[PDB]
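Extended Data, record ribonuclease H
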Amino acid sequence: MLKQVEIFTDGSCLGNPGPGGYGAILRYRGREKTFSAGYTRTTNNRMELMAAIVALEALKEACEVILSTDSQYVRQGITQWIHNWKKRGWKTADKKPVKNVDLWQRLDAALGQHQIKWEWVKGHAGHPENERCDELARAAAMNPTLEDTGYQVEV
């Protein structure tokens, strides 16, 4: 039994927008849960965000998490933008709503409950679990069954 919840995520997309999917591996309690879904029209960034949200939302109590992803958008958001956006009421300098505010606000809520250690992997050097995420994410996008509701060409 791991003394820390381990989370691995990836997302993929064939176009901008296009069909896309996500893969998330969660090691919680004594099992290994795998999540993966495809969406009809979405973006890469949205899928990488969706990876992390679905895994964290599966966490029913406050936990000590370690999340590993090679995603630069999650990283960039988490390390340099997020802190700034709350202070600005989730707006851009031009007073418009941030892009993917629906996903960022949603992930924000999910982290609020936990102790999190972020591990930024290099695409070419993740653990066997990040690669499986890549493969799940890819397969999902090849067979999309869901609609990405917050997507806009727009805002």
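Summary. Residues 1-155 form a domain with the Nucleotidyltransferase; domain 5 fold (CATH 3.30.420.10).
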